[PDB]
Amino acid sequence: YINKLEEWLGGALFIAIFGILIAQILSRQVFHSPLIWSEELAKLLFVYVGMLGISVAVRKQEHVFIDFLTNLMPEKIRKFTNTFVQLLVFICIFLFIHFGIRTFNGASFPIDALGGISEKWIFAALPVVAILMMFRFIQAQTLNFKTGKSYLPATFFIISAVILFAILFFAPDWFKVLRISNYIKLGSSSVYVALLVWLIIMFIGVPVGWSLFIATLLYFSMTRWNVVNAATEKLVYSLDSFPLLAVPFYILTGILMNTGGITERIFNFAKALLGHYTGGMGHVNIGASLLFSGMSGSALADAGGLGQLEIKAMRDAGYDDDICGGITAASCIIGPLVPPSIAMIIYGVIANESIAKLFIAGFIPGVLITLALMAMNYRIAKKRGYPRTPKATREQLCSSFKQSFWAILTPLLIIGGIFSGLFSPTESAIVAAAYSVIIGKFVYKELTLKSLFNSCIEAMAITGVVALMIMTVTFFGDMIAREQVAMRVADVFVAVADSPLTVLIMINALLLFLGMFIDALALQFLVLPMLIPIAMQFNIDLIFFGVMTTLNMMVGILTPPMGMALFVVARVGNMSVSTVTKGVLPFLIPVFVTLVLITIFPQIITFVPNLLI
Amino acid sequence: NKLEEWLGGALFIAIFGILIAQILSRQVFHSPLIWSEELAKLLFVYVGMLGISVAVRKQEHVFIDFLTNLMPEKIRKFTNTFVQLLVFICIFLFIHFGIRTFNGASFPIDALGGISEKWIFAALPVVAILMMFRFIQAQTLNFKTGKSYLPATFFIISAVILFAILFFAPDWFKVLRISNYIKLGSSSVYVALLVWLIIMFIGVPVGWSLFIATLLYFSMTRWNVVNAATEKLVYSLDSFPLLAVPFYILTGILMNTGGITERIFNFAKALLGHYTGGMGHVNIGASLLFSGMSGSALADAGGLGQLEIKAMRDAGYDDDICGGITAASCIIGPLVPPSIAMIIYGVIANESIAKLFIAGFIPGVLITLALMAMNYRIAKKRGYPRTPKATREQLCSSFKQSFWAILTPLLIIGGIFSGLFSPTESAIVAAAYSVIIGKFVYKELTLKSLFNSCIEAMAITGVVALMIMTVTFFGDMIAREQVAMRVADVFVAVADSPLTVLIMINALLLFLGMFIDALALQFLVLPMLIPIAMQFNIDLIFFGVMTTLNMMVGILTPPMGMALFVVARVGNMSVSTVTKGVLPFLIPVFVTLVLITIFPQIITFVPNLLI
Ligand code: NA
Ligand code: NA
């Protein structure tokens, strides 16, 4: 029809990348005859895949935005706010089109190890998909206006776009009027003004992926506009990255492993293993979450794939509702810590750090979290005197292990690939996806071509949202580093640079405070760009800083009044949010304790990666 | 699966806008552009490819169905299987030739900032792959309905193995060259022509039969020449005069609205409705006025037929007379400019289109006058009654109602004749005026209707584009083998007078027009007669007008004619009565044709004086 054209085309390109990578590994490992074009071809296709994902997201209106202030507004103000955000997004898309055309015209360098092919093939992705994004925005405007959620029809946008394109193509010297330098010369306060405007527009519902672009454009307009052409290439260059390839494949691996059949087998094995100790079903839940974390890079999937079973088992065992909710909500944070992890990949991409070292560093805190949660569950259960389930016979344990053998072999594969160094994170993700597909198709007989295509489509759709923010934050970093914001901030914060512990304490406190009202995914892209240079200023190790920031932000999904884990657990378990929060409250002590422990003693985190690499 | 329709319609409106900027800048701003024509051609190539793909998907390519209508279904199974296999081979070779030609072309375009010709030449394999996919999709339904013995999976595996062999072992193809076994020699072209006639009469579409015939001839002698010959396949569509066809078709479709046609009929009835035999005069005049805009006879037959038939029946006419008049009055369309057939002839023979239009204007008027005289005589002899004469108020109201409708033919004719606009520019202006009138003046136009009209125009132009490219490919072999010189050496005895050649050609065309449709017959006949006509020092404009008239004659001849069937369908009467009523009206057409072929000066004088 006329909406699935990006999903039909994007899905086909996703399959092509999978076939190319699997051929690269087979040739190197088996035949010892490596290929020189696989990486470049994969990155070239991934650029288009990411652009198509962005188009899908902007069509479905699914871009991340802060809704804390938006949730406390009568609709009569929401109408004006939505009108403003629609205008801002339209302007951003038009400027994307202009900059993509210009940077495609400017591409000159050839691509070696690809037959001398010019770089215009890479650089042409931006305008062709920006046109589709503009079409999708115009299409969505009709639905927005018809229901009374905005003030402007799509005819207004069509007329404005036609007029703007005609002006841009027939007299581009008319746009020099709207330069702030022509009226007021702020000087060195341009960065502060741009950041203030960025915060103001971000707090009123504008998505971050456009807010960063708007802030950077305002800064450039204030000082000088001719320096934007040099910096605009980073938008295309950010997607042309090898480490960024692992995100969609890890997402697809999690999606494929999150079927009902595999989860039931894993939970049955865990229950047969840890079901008869003091605090049985709590230990069962913790163990199941730990096992799932080795193959899943997200916490919401773990929360939504096992809650209805773990909560029921705990209720049958003799557990109160608050305890069930607390354990279920607390056990979710293990996922993002144990590798693989989307948050660690994002931090490594932003800070230009090796993902493997981040994974190795973050492996230990997951084990510490698991042990602390198990100890707390045992103490609570012993205090309350809950009954003990009968011991399982050896035959049932053996049968459950035989059933779940191939399902549980995956985390071992991931850890062996990563720790031993035989594979890179992207190759590890590719191997994991191939193994999961084989297991689903031939061993469990629970997969179909339609299901595989739908999983690929979902992975691309969730990848596009991250891709837009990645490219925009890469654009924002140039503005941040050009004017030396971090150096000035450090100079202002004098007499506190004596001890790095004070800086770490302040950063942790700020992150904890901000995590109570902003979702983790948005908070990461909101706070990292201005903190990474500041951390670099104080000679703070970047691997330890990344681990600490990831843990601190993952803590924030458990604290009221805004926490996704609390809402998900309450919805799944059919219980009120207040009871879930009350049950969660006693379980926040171990996480704070381990956070303080790693903050005081960085050697715990730093020892393992140094020994291994 | 509207993937081609959605993308093709987007390109169609892009072409329309670019052409508009060309004429406006050149007229009032006096700042002509240097890239509008190049962009128009470059986009028209893709538009034609998309139309061909759509036609392949819908299985609507033209073919001869005379012998196919006289055989049992058992034979039809084998015939359809053979046709499917031949089309599959044609599409595969199409893909291969597109890839080779794209990998060969390197020349730049100086009129577009040095852009390489690869941009033009890459449109062949990209759309060829989509055509192959559409054929595979249609094969499933063909096998499901029981019309063929070959399922789709067989085609899939055959395509896979063929692609693998081509990419990894092209040298294995050296066993299918006829030069391996026997060297036919000079008679290779004759053998290829015999195979072409047979494969056409079997039921293969023309646009593929010509390709098969020329490929067989090339493989008969040397396969290394087809590499040089394959550039014409893409260069054929890269033509600016060819752009007039889709826009004229769109203009006709837009103007064929029921509201406009009702007003035109009302004005014609108020004007010429009271004379003896008034209804026939009204029918002829309305057909002439609508042919001033349209360029197809089928629109004339199917649009205004019911109202004219009802008016004639009310007046007290007979069924045979009304049917005959309605059928015979539809041939004025292709004669009066604009006309699709004249454009096709000009493209094939490389002749000016404005000269063709000017030359062909007069015979349409002669036909109209002859038909009016014949109708008047028949009505007077049969003693039909007379209608009262309308008063000045009715005629003035009709004029005020249909002013904007009758403006368009005069605008088009004035643009063509005065030399102010080229035929493509005239088509663009006509389309713009029609859409403006529809949207704002009469208020019966919607954006969805415009998109549907554009889709229909693209679908109907793809079929013509495929035949155009294939016939241009065929002409290469025809010219290389020196067929016309051999034919002249054979019929040296016929060269006594050019009148003998003309009457022989006319008789052959008249005999061939009783079984084949006008379009298929034209595409079969023109490539073989144009070089022969040039051989005998025969003028090409006069020959084109005469051939167009002779081909248009065949649509009113039994046992095959589209006009008879359409008139019978829309008139609720048997085909036999329609034929027996048409028969007395064929005399003026034959008389006009004989008069034209006797005095070519009648056709020749007007364009030379007008130029
Ligand atoms: Na994980
Ligand atoms: Na006409």
PDB file of C-alpha atoms in Angstrom, chain A residues 4-144:
ATOM      1  CA  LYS A   4       4.714  -0.258   4.612  1.00  0.00           C
ATOM      2  CA  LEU A   5       7.107   0.817   1.838  1.00  0.00           C
ATOM      3  CA  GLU A   6       9.780   1.720   4.391  1.00  0.00           C
ATOM      4  CA  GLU A   7       9.165  -1.483   6.359  1.00  0.00           C
ATOM      5  CA  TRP A   8       9.224  -3.674   3.244  1.00  0.00           C
ATOM      6  CA  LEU A   9      12.454  -2.056   2.025  1.00  0.00           C
ATOM      7  CA  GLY A  10      14.044  -1.696   5.455  1.00  0.00           C
ATOM      8  CA  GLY A  11      13.434  -5.333   6.322  1.00  0.00           C
ATOM      9  CA  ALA A  12      15.083  -6.540   3.118  1.00  0.00           C
ATOM     10  CA  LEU A  13      18.206  -4.473   3.801  1.00  0.00           C
ATOM     11  CA  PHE A  14      18.324  -5.878   7.340  1.00  0.00           C
ATOM     12  CA  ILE A  15      18.456  -9.437   5.986  1.00  0.00           C
ATOM     13  CA  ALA A  16      21.193  -8.513   3.506  1.00  0.00           C
ATOM     14  CA  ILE A  17      23.451  -7.198   6.280  1.00  0.00           C
ATOM     15  CA  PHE A  18      22.999 -10.438   8.225  1.00  0.00           C
ATOM     16  CA  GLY A  19      24.054 -12.496   5.209  1.00  0.00           C
ATOM     17  CA  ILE A  20      27.144 -10.380   4.551  1.00  0.00           C
ATOM     18  CA  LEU A  21      28.462 -10.513   8.121  1.00  0.00           C
ATOM     19  CA  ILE A  22      27.975 -14.273   8.499  1.00  0.00           C
ATOM     20  CA  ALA A  23      30.064 -14.756   5.358  1.00  0.00           C
ATOM     21  CA  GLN A  24      32.871 -12.610   6.772  1.00  0.00           C
ATOM     22  CA  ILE A  25      33.181 -14.701   9.938  1.00  0.00           C
ATOM     23  CA  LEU A  26      32.996 -18.031   8.103  1.00  0.00           C
ATOM     24  CA  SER A  27      35.766 -17.074   5.673  1.00  0.00           C
ATOM     25  CA  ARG A  28      38.098 -15.826   8.407  1.00  0.00           C
ATOM     26  CA  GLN A  29      37.556 -18.580  10.974  1.00  0.00           C
ATOM     27  CA  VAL A  30      37.198 -21.611   8.689  1.00  0.00           C
ATOM     28  CA  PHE A  31      38.891 -20.830   5.371  1.00  0.00           C
ATOM     29  CA  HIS A  32      41.384 -18.265   6.764  1.00  0.00           C
ATOM     30  CA  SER A  33      40.688 -16.097   3.682  1.00  0.00           C
ATOM     31  CA  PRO A  34      39.269 -12.795   4.951  1.00  0.00           C
ATOM     32  CA  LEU A  35      37.130 -10.447   2.873  1.00  0.00           C
ATOM     33  CA  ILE A  36      37.984  -6.758   2.521  1.00  0.00           C
ATOM     34  CA  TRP A  37      34.582  -5.345   1.526  1.00  0.00           C
ATOM     35  CA  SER A  38      32.211  -6.848   4.111  1.00  0.00           C
ATOM     36  CA  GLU A  39      32.631  -4.169   6.788  1.00  0.00           C
ATOM     37  CA  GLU A  40      32.281  -1.234   4.391  1.00  0.00           C
ATOM     38  CA  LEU A  41      29.258  -2.791   2.693  1.00  0.00           C
ATOM     39  CA  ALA A  42      27.609  -3.499   6.049  1.00  0.00           C
ATOM     40  CA  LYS A  43      28.110   0.074   7.247  1.00  0.00           C
ATOM     41  CA  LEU A  44      26.854   1.477   3.936  1.00  0.00           C
ATOM     42  CA  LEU A  45      23.648  -0.554   4.193  1.00  0.00           C
ATOM     43  CA  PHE A  46      23.248   0.258   7.891  1.00  0.00           C
ATOM     44  CA  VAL A  47      23.205   3.989   7.155  1.00  0.00           C
ATOM     45  CA  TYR A  48      20.129   3.519   4.956  1.00  0.00           C
ATOM     46  CA  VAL A  49      18.559   1.133   7.479  1.00  0.00           C
ATOM     47  CA  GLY A  50      18.922   3.707  10.250  1.00  0.00           C
ATOM     48  CA  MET A  51      17.475   6.470   8.089  1.00  0.00           C
ATOM     49  CA  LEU A  52      14.477   4.277   7.251  1.00  0.00           C
ATOM     50  CA  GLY A  53      14.019   3.545  10.950  1.00  0.00           C
ATOM     51  CA  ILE A  54      14.005   7.276  11.664  1.00  0.00           C
ATOM     52  CA  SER A  55      11.365   7.721   8.959  1.00  0.00           C
ATOM     53  CA  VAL A  56       9.223   4.969  10.499  1.00  0.00           C
ATOM     54  CA  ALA A  57       9.517   6.549  13.943  1.00  0.00           C
ATOM     55  CA  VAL A  58       8.591  10.024  12.695  1.00  0.00           C
ATOM     56  CA  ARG A  59       5.615   8.540  10.842  1.00  0.00           C
ATOM     57  CA  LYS A  60       4.305   6.692  13.908  1.00  0.00           C
ATOM     58  CA  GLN A  61       5.080   9.599  16.294  1.00  0.00           C
ATOM     59  CA  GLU A  62       7.205   7.525  18.667  1.00  0.00           C
ATOM     60  CA  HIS A  63      10.245   9.731  19.329  1.00  0.00           C
ATOM     61  CA  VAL A  64      11.388  10.049  22.934  1.00  0.00           C
ATOM     62  CA  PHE A  65      10.385  13.203  24.799  1.00  0.00           C
ATOM     63  CA  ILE A  66      10.050  14.411  28.384  1.00  0.00           C
ATOM     64  CA  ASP A  67       6.436  14.326  29.581  1.00  0.00           C
ATOM     65  CA  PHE A  68       6.771  15.337  33.242  1.00  0.00           C
ATOM     66  CA  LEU A  69       5.550  18.893  32.636  1.00  0.00           C
ATOM     67  CA  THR A  70       3.243  17.785  29.796  1.00  0.00           C
ATOM     68  CA  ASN A  71       1.259  15.557  32.187  1.00  0.00           C
ATOM     69  CA  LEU A  72       0.311  18.549  34.381  1.00  0.00           C
ATOM     70  CA  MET A  73      -1.322  20.703  31.703  1.00  0.00           C
ATOM     71  CA  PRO A  74      -4.972  21.252  30.751  1.00  0.00           C
ATOM     72  CA  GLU A  75      -5.663  20.411  27.122  1.00  0.00           C
ATOM     73  CA  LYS A  76      -6.242  24.082  26.274  1.00  0.00           C
ATOM     74  CA  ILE A  77      -2.496  24.607  26.796  1.00  0.00           C
ATOM     75  CA  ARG A  78      -1.617  21.243  25.286  1.00  0.00           C
ATOM     76  CA  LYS A  79      -3.059  22.480  21.990  1.00  0.00           C
ATOM     77  CA  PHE A  80      -0.622  25.407  21.815  1.00  0.00           C
ATOM     78  CA  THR A  81       2.247  23.192  22.957  1.00  0.00           C
ATOM     79  CA  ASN A  82       1.515  20.624  20.242  1.00  0.00           C
ATOM     80  CA  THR A  83       1.275  23.367  17.615  1.00  0.00           C
ATOM     81  CA  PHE A  84       4.699  24.651  18.665  1.00  0.00           C
ATOM     82  CA  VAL A  85       6.324  21.214  18.597  1.00  0.00           C
ATOM     83  CA  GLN A  86       4.833  20.461  15.171  1.00  0.00           C
ATOM     84  CA  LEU A  87       6.265  23.715  13.810  1.00  0.00           C
ATOM     85  CA  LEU A  88       9.690  22.955  15.280  1.00  0.00           C
ATOM     86  CA  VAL A  89       9.759  19.441  13.814  1.00  0.00           C
ATOM     87  CA  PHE A  90       8.735  20.755  10.383  1.00  0.00           C
ATOM     88  CA  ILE A  91      11.591  23.269  10.449  1.00  0.00           C
ATOM     89  CA  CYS A  92      14.054  20.571  11.546  1.00  0.00           C
ATOM     90  CA  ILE A  93      13.024  18.260   8.699  1.00  0.00           C
ATOM     91  CA  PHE A  94      13.352  21.028   6.103  1.00  0.00           C
ATOM     92  CA  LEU A  95      16.833  21.879   7.364  1.00  0.00           C
ATOM     93  CA  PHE A  96      17.751  18.178   7.273  1.00  0.00           C
ATOM     94  CA  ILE A  97      16.773  18.133   3.597  1.00  0.00           C
ATOM     95  CA  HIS A  98      18.854  21.225   2.817  1.00  0.00           C
ATOM     96  CA  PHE A  99      21.944  20.022   4.682  1.00  0.00           C
ATOM     97  CA  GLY A 100      21.723  16.537   3.183  1.00  0.00           C
ATOM     98  CA  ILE A 101      21.581  17.944  -0.340  1.00  0.00           C
ATOM     99  CA  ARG A 102      24.543  20.223   0.359  1.00  0.00           C
ATOM    100  CA  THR A 103      26.681  17.520   1.980  1.00  0.00           C
ATOM    101  CA  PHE A 104      25.909  15.087  -0.843  1.00  0.00           C
ATOM    102  CA  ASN A 105      27.080  17.717  -3.320  1.00  0.00           C
ATOM    103  CA  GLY A 106      30.213  18.166  -1.209  1.00  0.00           C
ATOM    104  CA  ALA A 107      31.242  14.496  -1.046  1.00  0.00           C
ATOM    105  CA  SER A 108      34.503  13.926  -2.910  1.00  0.00           C
ATOM    106  CA  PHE A 109      36.634  11.248  -1.242  1.00  0.00           C
ATOM    107  CA  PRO A 110      36.698   7.703  -2.657  1.00  0.00           C
ATOM    108  CA  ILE A 111      36.145   4.535  -0.642  1.00  0.00           C
ATOM    109  CA  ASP A 112      39.231   2.333  -0.700  1.00  0.00           C
ATOM    110  CA  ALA A 113      38.871  -1.446  -0.406  1.00  0.00           C
ATOM    111  CA  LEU A 114      35.556  -1.021  -2.249  1.00  0.00           C
ATOM    112  CA  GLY A 115      36.751  -0.737  -5.845  1.00  0.00           C
ATOM    113  CA  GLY A 116      37.315   3.017  -5.778  1.00  0.00           C
ATOM    114  CA  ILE A 117      33.619   3.730  -5.271  1.00  0.00           C
ATOM    115  CA  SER A 118      32.983   7.363  -4.368  1.00  0.00           C
ATOM    116  CA  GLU A 119      31.555   8.403  -0.998  1.00  0.00           C
ATOM    117  CA  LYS A 120      28.459   9.932  -2.619  1.00  0.00           C
ATOM    118  CA  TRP A 121      26.828   6.512  -2.245  1.00  0.00           C
ATOM    119  CA  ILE A 122      27.147   6.852   1.532  1.00  0.00           C
ATOM    120  CA  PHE A 123      26.247  10.546   1.584  1.00  0.00           C
ATOM    121  CA  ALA A 124      23.123  10.230  -0.595  1.00  0.00           C
ATOM    122  CA  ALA A 125      21.091   8.510   2.138  1.00  0.00           C
ATOM    123  CA  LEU A 126      20.167  11.706   3.989  1.00  0.00           C
ATOM    124  CA  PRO A 127      18.068  13.567   1.360  1.00  0.00           C
ATOM    125  CA  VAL A 128      16.241  10.589  -0.170  1.00  0.00           C
ATOM    126  CA  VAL A 129      14.962   9.503   3.244  1.00  0.00           C
ATOM    127  CA  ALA A 130      14.464  13.082   4.443  1.00  0.00           C
ATOM    128  CA  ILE A 131      11.931  13.478   1.623  1.00  0.00           C
ATOM    129  CA  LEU A 132      10.063  10.438   2.953  1.00  0.00           C
ATOM    130  CA  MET A 133      10.248  11.880   6.471  1.00  0.00           C
ATOM    131  CA  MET A 134       8.696  15.132   5.243  1.00  0.00           C
ATOM    132  CA  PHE A 135       5.938  13.187   3.483  1.00  0.00           C
ATOM    133  CA  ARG A 136       5.237  11.171   6.637  1.00  0.00           C
ATOM    134  CA  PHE A 137       5.098  14.330   8.756  1.00  0.00           C
ATOM    135  CA  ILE A 138       2.620  15.936   6.360  1.00  0.00           C
ATOM    136  CA  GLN A 139       0.554  12.735   6.429  1.00  0.00           C
ATOM    137  CA  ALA A 140       0.496  12.647  10.234  1.00  0.00           C
ATOM    138  CA  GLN A 141      -0.545  16.301  10.404  1.00  0.00           C
ATOM    139  CA  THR A 142      -3.995  15.409   9.040  1.00  0.00           C
ATOM    140  CA  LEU A 143      -4.577  12.933  11.868  1.00  0.00           C
ATOM    141  CA  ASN A 144      -3.197  15.403  14.414  1.00  0.00           C
TER     142      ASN A 144
END
